[PDB]
Amino acid sequence: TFEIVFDSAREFESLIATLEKFFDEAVFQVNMEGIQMRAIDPSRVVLVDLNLPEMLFSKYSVESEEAIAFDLKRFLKVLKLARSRDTLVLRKGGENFLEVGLLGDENTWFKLPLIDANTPEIEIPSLPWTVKAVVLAGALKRAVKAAKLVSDSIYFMATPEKLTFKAEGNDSEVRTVLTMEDPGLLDLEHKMTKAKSAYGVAYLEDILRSLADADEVIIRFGFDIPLLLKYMVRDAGEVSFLIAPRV
Amino acid sequence: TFEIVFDSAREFESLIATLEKFFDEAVFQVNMEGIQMRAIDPSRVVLVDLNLPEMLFSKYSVESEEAIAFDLKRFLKVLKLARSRDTLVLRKGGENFLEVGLLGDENTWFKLPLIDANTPEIEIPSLPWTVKAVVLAGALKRAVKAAKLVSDSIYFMATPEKLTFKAEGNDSEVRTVLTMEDPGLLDLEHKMTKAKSAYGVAYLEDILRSLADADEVIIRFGFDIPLLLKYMVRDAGEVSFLIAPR
Amino acid sequence: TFEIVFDSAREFESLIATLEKFFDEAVFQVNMEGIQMRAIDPSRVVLVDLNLPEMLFSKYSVESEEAIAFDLKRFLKVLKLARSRDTLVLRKGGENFLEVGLLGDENTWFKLPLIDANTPEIEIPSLPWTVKAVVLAGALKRAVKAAKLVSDSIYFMATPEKLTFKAEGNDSEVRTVLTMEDPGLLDLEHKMTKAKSAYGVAYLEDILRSLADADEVIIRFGFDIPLLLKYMVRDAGEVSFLIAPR
């Protein structure tokens, strides 16, 4: 049994929008100290690790901890009805429905059918990342969107002064390059000197679309090793994607 | 023969854009007293009644009382070009054409043909409404829009305390609740204490889309009777829909 | 070897967007004095003339002169990535590719492949035009949109007093009138009393689209002749279009 209240349904819409891009269904582990989800796409290209601690929520109250599961696209449509300043209520009682409320000038209350919550354990390898950077979302979205014109793949490369995103096609190429001189780069740490991998443009663009240009995004990578893109949610939540490399 | 002038071609557009979701052609009855329309849609769920008194027009000048009939979608496209402050002119002179003027920074005049002006006399049957309400459009549009997710029809329900719009459909339901403290509900009148009737989501959508969020809408419904959605035009006009229950 | 640096990618985008509606490719003579392009469209009814003198650019280093050709949609799509905060760089080297620089918060550098510069020399004909006029794009946009609703053809007309944009056929007509009292008409020049030619509604639409309502357009027509449609670029360079009549 739970009742959780978040003060921005629209913020939450935007997390759900990123998830629906990769998964048809999500399992939410609802615990005393917060919400967690971990899932992988059927292509095994994309892994999400999501942690939403209770402190993020206006009211948070859970009795028995349990996993709920529901159709991402169904939930997303409800959330797309939220107006500015609507609050969000997620509520579960006795039956097997998630109750969803949108509270504004009117109060709108949906009930959505829950489904089989059988997530098998997902284990996260340790990963020898040699690069780590903090960049602005608008900068990445630039890079990524410039790659798409040229290719389905984007190269992430670093030296210790240099963060470069490049693509190459049959007859075109595109380098976007960031140093400590640019606003979009906040931080750049190399544990070495040569670092290069490729990831699927389509995948990254779907990850970065909800974020506002000004959101900080954390990046970690290496040679032919999964890419990390992590966003802090109100300085407490985490949202983490691992994206498998290419070639 | 007439010449009629309205202050806001854009305002006029909103009305036409509604009529147009339900009809291909409109028959406007032009009288000394004003303009009138009343018809039922081909599908036969919706009745519209439209009174625009002389009062609303900056110039109203009828030389004789005419029925005139035109393609809605051709008229509407005309009005969609109206700019921010444009005046609208309607004029028939001695021929089968409606002179349409959009008067502003640019002056634009259309001649569009009249079609065969034939629509029957119709009686609006007084019917036993148990619930009345004045709500803001925005509120009803959200309600319908949230109902549409779950189902094809939406229930209008009232207690003396509240108006609720519900929908049950497949393995899902939704409820939208309004109380008197909310800005969306200005007035609730009841004769009976309970009220329940179902309607077409798709129709309601179409009636409501031209409305501003802040427009007052009067609703009258009851135990299994057509719904009356009404709104007033600059206070003196009236646009009314009767939607059949399901 | 040339490095040209333009102030506003976004303005440059607007121009490109237009050309693209008409050519899939374009040749650009990069000269010591400016960039020029003359070219008739595959479908034969439109001629573009473009000339952008060195002074428009914030930098105009150009070691030696050459023509360069390229796909427009590819260029265009790049320029559409340009944000508010972006400055445009067009660089050429020994290699056979156009380098394209979006300089703003971050810097993006593209390499687009230069294609075959096979472009006929074209002589701009002498024209017995009778009326030139300066008008606001917005006004003409009205004109043209109003015309589309009635025909694939719009008549451009002039008296010493007014500009009329008229069209007909279906069973309807439409005129848009622009007098000197109207803000949309700045300037009216006459070698003769009147003018009248008819042009492709579609071709106009495509031209006017990247234009803002407040942009000044020079138009110049006569009796059954092409129309010159020409605007300025930072009041220095020009882009002009000739449109065969009907």
Side-chain angles (χ1 to χ4, degrees):
Chain A
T1 285
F2 64 80
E3 178 157 307
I4 283 164
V5 182
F6 189 67
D7 63 14
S8 182
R10 265 158 133 215
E11 253 168 27
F12 214 87
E13 182 279 339
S14 138
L15 182 72
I16 297 308
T18 309
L19 306 184
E20 191 277 325
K21 286 305 170 69
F22 305 100
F23 322 104
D24 306 308
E25 323 194 310
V27 182
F28 269 10
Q29 184 74 43
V30 191
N31 301 333
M32 272 265 300
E33 66 292 347
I35 284 148
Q36 290 171 346
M37 165 187 165
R38 184 168 303 175
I40 305 181
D41 84 305
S43 203
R44 317 297 174 198
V45 177
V46 172
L47 176 157
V48 77
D49 190 24
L50 163 61
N51 174 83
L52 301 179
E54 68 179 323
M55 83 172 65
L56 275 172
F57 298 87
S58 326
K59 305 260 136 177
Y60 190 88
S61 141
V62 175
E63 317 233 306
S64 266
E65 323 198 299
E66 67 155 307
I68 46 174
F70 44 88
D71 194 57
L72 266 161
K73 177 187 289 92
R74 252 190 136 129
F75 187 35
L76 176 60
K77 296 174 160 200
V78 169
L79 294 174
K80 280 172 142 288
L81 311 167
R83 286 221 301 148
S84 46
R85 302 160 284 98
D86 281 340
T87 75
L88 167 56
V89 181
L90 307 167
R91 180 197 284 159
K92 187 179 174 295
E95 277 110 284
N96 295 255
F97 273 95
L98 168 72
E99 174 164 36
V100 184
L102 295 179
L103 319 194
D105 298 330
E106 315 78 45
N107 293 354
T108 290
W109 292 97
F110 278 95
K111 275 192 279 205
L112 321 166
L114 292 170
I115 73 198
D116 201 351
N118 283 354
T119 266
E121 203 47 10
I122 301 169
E123 272 280 330
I124 175 176
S126 222
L127 282 170
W129 289 305
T130 59
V131 181
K132 157 181 207 197
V134 191
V135 301
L136 284 182
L140 284 202
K141 282 194 273 191
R142 143 64 46 98
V144 167
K145 221 164 274 199
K148 173 139 80 138
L149 247 29
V150 166
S151 177
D152 47 290
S153 278
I154 184 166
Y155 283 91
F156 272 54
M157 316 174 54
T159 73
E161 297 81 13
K162 222 170 227 163
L163 186 73
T164 309
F165 311 98
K166 82 195 215 207
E168 193 175 355
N170 65 321
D171 58 352
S172 51
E173 91 200 52
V174 66
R175 195 172 266 237
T176 288
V177 48
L178 299 197
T179 69
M180 278 317 297
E181 230 144 344
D182 312 291
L185 192 64
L186 300 183
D187 177 45
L188 173 62
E189 215 55 63
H190 209 316
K191 242 185 285 164
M192 197 196 163
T193 249
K194 323 197 81 188
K196 177 204 273 217
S197 170
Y199 312 94
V201 164
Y203 297 94
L204 308 199
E205 154 170 69
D206 278 343
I207 296 177
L208 303 163
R209 188 179 281 112
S210 286
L211 301 182
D213 287 344
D215 302 334
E216 295 177 32
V217 175
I218 295 180
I219 293 164
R220 292 181 156 107
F221 61 100
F223 170 71
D224 200 284
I225 267 73
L227 161 78
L228 171 71
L229 303 189
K230 170 172 176 159
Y231 52 97
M232 294 319 201
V233 13
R234 291 177 189 187
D235 247 57
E238 281 192 354
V239 186
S240 298
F241 295 94
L242 305 171
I243 304 95
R246 272 208 180 167
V247 88
Chain B
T1 294
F2 61 78
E3 188 173 57
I4 278 152
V5 187
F6 184 63
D7 333 32
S8 181
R10 278 190 150 251
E11 262 177 57
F12 209 97
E13 186 274 335
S14 318
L15 165 53
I16 295 303
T18 312
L19 291 187
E20 193 277 347
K21 297 286 168 205
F22 297 110
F23 318 79
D24 303 302
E25 63 207 345
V27 172
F28 285 19
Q29 187 45 48
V30 188
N31 297 321
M32 304 305 160
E33 282 73 67
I35 297 165
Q36 280 146 50
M37 197 218 71
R38 175 179 309 190
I40 303 163
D41 86 300
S43 77
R44 264 203 61 90
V45 173
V46 172
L47 179 157
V48 189
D49 190 67
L50 166 70
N51 193 42
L52 302 155
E54 177 277 315
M55 215 264 188
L56 309 153
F57 299 90
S58 54
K59 192 248 254 37
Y60 198 78
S61 172
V62 248
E63 191 274 297
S64 59
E65 294 179 4
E66 279 191 50
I68 54 133
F70 43 74
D71 200 272
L72 275 165
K73 205 204 182 212
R74 274 199 291 208
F75 189 34
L76 189 57
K77 270 164 151 60
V78 158
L79 299 159
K80 268 175 195 179
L81 305 155
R83 283 195 66 67
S84 172
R85 285 203 168 276
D86 290 329
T87 310
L88 161 76
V89 178
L90 308 180
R91 176 194 288 160
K92 195 206 142 257
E95 45 157 75
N96 250 29
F97 284 96
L98 174 64
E99 213 135 18
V100 184
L102 300 182
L103 308 194
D105 277 6
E106 308 104 23
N107 279 11
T108 305
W109 288 96
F110 292 79
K111 278 278 205 64
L112 349 140
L114 301 166
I115 60 195
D116 274 44
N118 213 42
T119 212
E121 269 310 282
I122 283 161
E123 313 280 323
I124 176 165
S126 90
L127 287 190
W129 64 261
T130 52
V131 170
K132 201 195 64 58
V134 183
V135 292
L136 304 181
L140 297 162
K141 297 187 211 165
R142 280 145 213 148
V144 164
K145 225 175 275 161
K148 208 192 180 200
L149 255 26
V150 151
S151 171
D152 43 285
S153 32
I154 169 176
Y155 292 62
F156 280 44
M157 306 185 47
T159 51
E161 222 98 34
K162 61 228 173 51
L163 258 181
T164 118
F165 312 85
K166 62 185 204 194
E168 304 152 15
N170 49 46
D171 41 11
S172 188
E173 33 176 284
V174 58
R175 190 173 261 221
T176 296
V177 169
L178 266 176
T179 70
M180 218 101 51
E181 258 108 350
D182 299 324
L185 174 55
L186 299 203
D187 176 306
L188 187 59
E189 174 174 351
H190 63 284
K191 284 203 202 180
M192 263 279 314
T193 79
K194 287 207 60 183
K196 191 146 175 179
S197 263
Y199 316 96
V201 162
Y203 297 107
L204 273 164
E205 220 173 18
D206 281 342
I207 276 137
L208 288 166
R209 70 218 312 143
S210 295
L211 249 14
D213 282 8
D215 295 319
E216 306 181 9
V217 171
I218 309 149
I219 57 176
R220 262 149 203 143
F221 64 99
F223 287 173
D224 291 291
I225 294 158
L227 161 80
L228 185 54
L229 289 206
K230 191 174 181 176
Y231 63 87
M232 305 299 194
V233 196
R234 286 187 180 184
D235 291 318
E238 257 168 50
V239 194
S240 295
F241 306 78
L242 282 151
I243 311 99
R246 255 152 144 77
Chain C
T1 306
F2 70 63
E3 190 183 72
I4 286 98
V5 179
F6 198 68
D7 193 338
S8 160
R10 270 200 156 255
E11 277 171 40
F12 210 79
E13 184 278 340
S14 314
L15 174 65
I16 301 320
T18 313
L19 307 171
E20 191 267 320
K21 298 257 174 44
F22 290 118
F23 313 78
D24 306 300
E25 34 198 287
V27 194
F28 276 43
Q29 191 177 138
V30 181
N31 289 123
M32 215 76 163
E33 53 270 326
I35 297 163
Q36 292 174 239
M37 171 193 160
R38 195 162 281 150
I40 309 196
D41 69 299
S43 72
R44 299 311 297 198
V45 23
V46 164
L47 188 149
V48 58
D49 189 82
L50 150 69
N51 155 72
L52 298 165
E54 100 108 81
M55 71 139 276
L56 293 177
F57 307 95
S58 330
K59 181 142 178 157
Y60 199 81
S61 211
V62 36
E63 175 262 31
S64 80
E65 308 155 312
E66 44 161 325
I68 63 173
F70 55 80
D71 187 300
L72 284 186
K73 205 175 193 315
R74 295 181 91 196
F75 195 41
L76 169 63
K77 280 168 154 175
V78 161
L79 263 38
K80 286 193 151 75
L81 294 179
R83 272 192 330 115
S84 340
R85 351 304 220 85
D86 297 316
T87 265
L88 178 53
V89 186
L90 291 180
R91 187 194 291 147
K92 169 87 188 204
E95 284 170 287
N96 185 65
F97 55 83
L98 179 65
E99 201 171 2
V100 187
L102 300 193
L103 282 26
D105 280 326
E106 334 80 354
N107 308 299
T108 305
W109 286 105
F110 287 83
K111 285 183 202 202
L112 310 183
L114 294 174
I115 83 172
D116 203 62
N118 185 24
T119 170
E121 188 58 45
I122 298 174
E123 219 86 340
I124 47 142
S126 202
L127 279 192
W129 62 271
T130 70
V131 168
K132 191 192 253 213
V134 182
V135 284
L136 294 190
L140 287 183
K141 280 176 156 156
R142 160 58 77 85
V144 177
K145 290 206 161 65
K148 195 179 181 181
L149 262 55
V150 159
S151 160
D152 13 38
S153 286
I154 176 168
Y155 296 91
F156 280 40
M157 302 181 55
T159 60
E161 209 83 44
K162 48 185 208 147
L163 287 176
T164 303
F165 303 92
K166 200 174 171 86
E168 61 138 83
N170 247 38
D171 38 355
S172 52
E173 63 188 40
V174 58
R175 59 179 166 105
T176 302
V177 157
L178 206 62
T179 78
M180 207 89 219
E181 296 54 70
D182 299 335
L185 171 55
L186 303 209
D187 177 277
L188 199 46
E189 155 164 18
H190 286 288
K191 293 213 205 113
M192 272 189 69
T193 173
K194 292 147 166 162
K196 173 161 160 180
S197 318
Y199 306 86
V201 124
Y203 292 101
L204 302 189
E205 202 156 52
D206 282 318
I207 274 159
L208 298 158
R209 185 170 272 111
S210 278
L211 289 163
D213 293 358
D215 292 321
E216 293 188 3
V217 192
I218 303 148
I219 51 153
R220 179 186 80 173
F221 57 107
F223 306 98
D224 282 68
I225 58 173
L227 168 88
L228 175 69
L229 207 160
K230 164 198 209 196
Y231 54 93
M232 294 307 176
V233 187
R234 305 185 186 254
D235 312 280
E238 53 257 305
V239 198
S240 11
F241 294 89
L242 277 156
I243 300 90
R246 292 174 183 195

mmCIF file of all heavy atoms in Angstrom, chain B residues 159-181:
data_model
loop_
_atom_site.group_PDB
_atom_site.id
_atom_site.type_symbol
_atom_site.label_atom_id
_atom_site.label_comp_id
_atom_site.label_asym_id
_atom_site.label_seq_id
_atom_site.Cartn_x
_atom_site.Cartn_y
_atom_site.Cartn_z
ATOM 1 N N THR B 159 -23.655 15.674 -7.725
ATOM 2 C CA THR B 159 -24.196 15.564 -6.356
ATOM 3 C C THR B 159 -24.387 17.034 -5.982
ATOM 4 O O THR B 159 -23.954 17.889 -6.756
ATOM 5 C CB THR B 159 -23.171 14.962 -5.437
ATOM 6 O OG1 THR B 159 -21.945 15.702 -5.596
ATOM 7 C CG2 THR B 159 -22.930 13.467 -5.775
ATOM 8 N N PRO B 160 -25.017 17.352 -4.818
ATOM 9 C CA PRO B 160 -25.288 18.795 -4.628
ATOM 10 C C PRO B 160 -24.002 19.561 -4.366
ATOM 11 O O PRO B 160 -23.919 20.770 -4.574
ATOM 12 C CB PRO B 160 -26.219 18.839 -3.403
ATOM 13 C CG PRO B 160 -26.564 17.373 -3.088
ATOM 14 C CD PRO B 160 -25.405 16.569 -3.627
ATOM 15 N N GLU B 161 -23.020 18.814 -3.899
ATOM 16 C CA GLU B 161 -21.662 19.239 -3.728
ATOM 17 C C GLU B 161 -20.814 19.280 -5.029
ATOM 18 O O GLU B 161 -19.982 20.172 -5.156
ATOM 19 C CB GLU B 161 -20.998 18.256 -2.757
ATOM 20 C CG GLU B 161 -20.097 18.913 -1.699
ATOM 21 C CD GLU B 161 -20.804 19.092 -0.349
ATOM 22 O OE1 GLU B 161 -21.633 18.209 0.005
ATOM 23 O OE2 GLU B 161 -20.517 20.100 0.357
ATOM 24 N N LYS B 162 -20.969 18.350 -5.982
ATOM 25 C CA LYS B 162 -19.990 18.279 -7.091
ATOM 26 C C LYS B 162 -20.372 17.730 -8.464
ATOM 27 O O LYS B 162 -21.245 16.878 -8.600
ATOM 28 C CB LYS B 162 -18.671 17.584 -6.639
ATOM 29 C CG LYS B 162 -18.744 16.139 -6.163
ATOM 30 C CD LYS B 162 -17.952 16.026 -4.833
ATOM 31 C CE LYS B 162 -18.077 14.645 -4.112
ATOM 32 N NZ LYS B 162 -17.796 13.457 -5.038
ATOM 33 N N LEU B 163 -19.658 18.220 -9.474
ATOM 34 C CA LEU B 163 -19.784 17.758 -10.820
ATOM 35 C C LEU B 163 -18.625 16.838 -11.072
ATOM 36 O O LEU B 163 -17.483 17.179 -10.775
ATOM 37 C CB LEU B 163 -19.697 18.918 -11.811
ATOM 38 C CG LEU B 163 -20.941 19.481 -12.458
ATOM 39 C CD1 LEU B 163 -20.572 20.617 -13.415
ATOM 40 C CD2 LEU B 163 -21.771 18.367 -13.173
ATOM 41 N N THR B 164 -18.913 15.661 -11.600
ATOM 42 C CA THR B 164 -17.844 14.796 -11.975
ATOM 43 C C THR B 164 -18.043 14.272 -13.400
ATOM 44 O O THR B 164 -19.174 14.129 -13.860
ATOM 45 C CB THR B 164 -17.484 13.747 -10.883
ATOM 46 O OG1 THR B 164 -17.689 12.423 -11.371
ATOM 47 C CG2 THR B 164 -18.227 13.969 -9.580
ATOM 48 N N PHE B 165 -16.949 14.068 -14.123
ATOM 49 C CA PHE B 165 -16.985 13.535 -15.508
ATOM 50 C C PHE B 165 -16.207 12.243 -15.472
ATOM 51 O O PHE B 165 -15.025 12.283 -15.165
ATOM 52 C CB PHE B 165 -16.389 14.561 -16.480
ATOM 53 C CG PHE B 165 -16.934 15.943 -16.268
ATOM 54 C CD1 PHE B 165 -16.372 16.793 -15.317
ATOM 55 C CD2 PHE B 165 -18.079 16.370 -16.954
ATOM 56 C CE1 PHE B 165 -16.912 18.079 -15.104
ATOM 57 C CE2 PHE B 165 -18.635 17.631 -16.738
ATOM 58 C CZ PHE B 165 -18.042 18.506 -15.807
ATOM 59 N N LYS B 166 -16.877 11.098 -15.658
ATOM 60 C CA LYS B 166 -16.174 9.800 -15.618
ATOM 61 C C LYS B 166 -16.221 8.962 -16.901
ATOM 62 O O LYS B 166 -17.038 9.189 -17.806
ATOM 63 C CB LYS B 166 -16.416 8.965 -14.343
ATOM 64 C CG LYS B 166 -17.846 8.498 -14.012
ATOM 65 C CD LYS B 166 -17.911 7.764 -12.587
ATOM 66 C CE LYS B 166 -19.130 6.759 -12.408
ATOM 67 N NZ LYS B 166 -19.467 6.251 -10.976
ATOM 68 N N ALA B 167 -15.312 8.006 -16.971
ATOM 69 C CA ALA B 167 -15.229 7.119 -18.114
ATOM 70 C C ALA B 167 -14.590 5.809 -17.687
ATOM 71 O O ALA B 167 -13.627 5.797 -16.922
ATOM 72 C CB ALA B 167 -14.457 7.751 -19.211
ATOM 73 N N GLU B 168 -15.182 4.714 -18.147
ATOM 74 C CA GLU B 168 -14.741 3.364 -17.806
ATOM 75 C C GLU B 168 -14.622 2.752 -19.165
ATOM 76 O O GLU B 168 -15.453 2.991 -20.039
ATOM 77 C CB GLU B 168 -15.777 2.600 -16.954
ATOM 78 C CG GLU B 168 -16.222 3.261 -15.626
ATOM 79 C CD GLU B 168 -17.660 2.857 -15.186
ATOM 80 O OE1 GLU B 168 -18.207 1.866 -15.744
ATOM 81 O OE2 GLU B 168 -18.243 3.547 -14.287
ATOM 82 N N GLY B 169 -13.567 1.998 -19.386
ATOM 83 C CA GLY B 169 -13.288 1.596 -20.736
ATOM 84 C C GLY B 169 -12.065 0.734 -20.832
ATOM 85 O O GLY B 169 -10.970 1.145 -20.387
ATOM 86 N N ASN B 170 -12.262 -0.407 -21.508
ATOM 87 C CA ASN B 170 -11.395 -1.589 -21.443
ATOM 88 C C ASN B 170 -11.164 -2.155 -20.003
ATOM 89 O O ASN B 170 -11.955 -3.000 -19.549
ATOM 90 C CB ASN B 170 -10.115 -1.492 -22.334
ATOM 91 C CG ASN B 170 -9.332 -0.181 -22.173
ATOM 92 O OD1 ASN B 170 -9.078 0.285 -21.055
ATOM 93 N ND2 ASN B 170 -8.898 0.388 -23.308
ATOM 94 N N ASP B 171 -10.120 -1.661 -19.313
ATOM 95 C CA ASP B 171 -9.692 -2.115 -17.974
ATOM 96 C C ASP B 171 -9.029 -0.913 -17.337
ATOM 97 O O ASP B 171 -7.875 -0.956 -16.896
ATOM 98 C CB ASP B 171 -8.641 -3.211 -18.108
ATOM 99 C CG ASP B 171 -7.642 -2.914 -19.225
ATOM 100 O OD1 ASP B 171 -7.663 -1.747 -19.744
ATOM 101 O OD2 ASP B 171 -6.878 -3.850 -19.596
ATOM 102 N N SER B 172 -9.778 0.180 -17.340
ATOM 103 C CA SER B 172 -9.278 1.461 -16.957
ATOM 104 C C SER B 172 -10.456 2.350 -16.627
ATOM 105 O O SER B 172 -11.553 2.138 -17.100
ATOM 106 C CB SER B 172 -8.485 2.046 -18.111
ATOM 107 O OG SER B 172 -7.823 3.222 -17.705
ATOM 108 N N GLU B 173 -10.229 3.353 -15.794
ATOM 109 C CA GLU B 173 -11.225 4.363 -15.589
ATOM 110 C C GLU B 173 -10.584 5.662 -15.228
ATOM 111 O O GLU B 173 -9.441 5.675 -14.856
ATOM 112 C CB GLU B 173 -12.286 3.963 -14.557
ATOM 113 C CG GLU B 173 -11.838 3.102 -13.427
ATOM 114 C CD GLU B 173 -12.986 2.860 -12.427
ATOM 115 O OE1 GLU B 173 -13.296 3.804 -11.643
ATOM 116 O OE2 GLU B 173 -13.580 1.741 -12.450
ATOM 117 N N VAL B 174 -11.338 6.745 -15.376
ATOM 118 C CA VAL B 174 -10.872 8.054 -15.035
ATOM 119 C C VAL B 174 -12.045 8.822 -14.461
ATOM 120 O O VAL B 174 -13.170 8.613 -14.829
ATOM 121 C CB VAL B 174 -10.257 8.815 -16.251
ATOM 122 C CG1 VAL B 174 -11.242 8.957 -17.395
ATOM 123 C CG2 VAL B 174 -9.749 10.177 -15.820
ATOM 124 N N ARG B 175 -11.748 9.748 -13.573
ATOM 125 C CA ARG B 175 -12.771 10.564 -12.968
ATOM 126 C C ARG B 175 -12.132 11.957 -12.917
ATOM 127 O O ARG B 175 -10.958 12.090 -12.577
ATOM 128 C CB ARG B 175 -13.088 9.999 -11.568
ATOM 129 C CG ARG B 175 -14.290 10.581 -10.897
ATOM 130 C CD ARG B 175 -14.660 9.872 -9.572
ATOM 131 N NE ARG B 175 -15.752 8.898 -9.808
ATOM 132 C CZ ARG B 175 -16.805 8.681 -9.004
ATOM 133 N NH1 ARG B 175 -16.969 9.363 -7.871
ATOM 134 N NH2 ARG B 175 -17.706 7.766 -9.348
ATOM 135 N N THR B 176 -12.899 12.968 -13.331
ATOM 136 C CA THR B 176 -12.579 14.378 -13.100
ATOM 137 C C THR B 176 -13.679 14.996 -12.209
ATOM 138 O O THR B 176 -14.878 14.984 -12.519
ATOM 139 C CB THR B 176 -12.397 15.131 -14.419
ATOM 140 O OG1 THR B 176 -11.259 14.585 -15.138
ATOM 141 C CG2 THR B 176 -12.186 16.667 -14.170
ATOM 142 N N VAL B 177 -13.224 15.555 -11.096
ATOM 143 C CA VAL B 177 -14.047 16.178 -10.072
ATOM 144 C C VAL B 177 -13.863 17.718 -9.976
ATOM 145 O O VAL B 177 -12.738 18.239 -10.044
ATOM 146 C CB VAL B 177 -13.736 15.471 -8.762
ATOM 147 C CG1 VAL B 177 -14.329 16.205 -7.533
ATOM 148 C CG2 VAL B 177 -14.225 13.998 -8.852
ATOM 149 N N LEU B 178 -14.992 18.428 -9.852
ATOM 150 C CA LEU B 178 -15.053 19.889 -9.686
ATOM 151 C C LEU B 178 -15.909 20.149 -8.481
ATOM 152 O O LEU B 178 -16.936 19.506 -8.337
ATOM 153 C CB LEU B 178 -15.771 20.545 -10.855
ATOM 154 C CG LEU B 178 -14.892 21.028 -11.981
ATOM 155 C CD1 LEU B 178 -15.669 21.589 -13.162
ATOM 156 C CD2 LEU B 178 -13.935 22.065 -11.437
ATOM 157 N N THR B 179 -15.504 21.072 -7.619
ATOM 158 C CA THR B 179 -16.353 21.483 -6.488
ATOM 159 C C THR B 179 -16.527 22.974 -6.589
ATOM 160 O O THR B 179 -15.924 23.629 -7.461
ATOM 161 C CB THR B 179 -15.694 21.198 -5.151
ATOM 162 O OG1 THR B 179 -14.611 22.107 -5.009
ATOM 163 C CG2 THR B 179 -15.124 19.780 -5.077
ATOM 164 N N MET B 180 -17.310 23.552 -5.684
ATOM 165 C CA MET B 180 -17.638 24.975 -5.819
ATOM 166 C C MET B 180 -16.478 25.952 -5.589
ATOM 167 O O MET B 180 -16.521 27.090 -6.059
ATOM 168 C CB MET B 180 -18.808 25.336 -4.919
ATOM 169 C CG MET B 180 -19.771 26.363 -5.593
ATOM 170 S SD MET B 180 -21.232 25.523 -6.256
ATOM 171 C CE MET B 180 -21.735 24.554 -4.782
ATOM 172 N N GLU B 181 -15.443 25.495 -4.884
ATOM 173 C CA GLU B 181 -14.267 26.305 -4.543
ATOM 174 C C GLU B 181 -13.354 26.450 -5.754
ATOM 175 O O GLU B 181 -12.567 27.392 -5.877
ATOM 176 C CB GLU B 181 -13.487 25.628 -3.410
ATOM 177 C CG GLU B 181 -13.707 26.258 -2.054
ATOM 178 C CD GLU B 181 -14.550 25.402 -1.088
ATOM 179 O OE1 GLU B 181 -15.130 24.376 -1.532
ATOM 180 O OE2 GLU B 181 -14.637 25.772 0.122
#
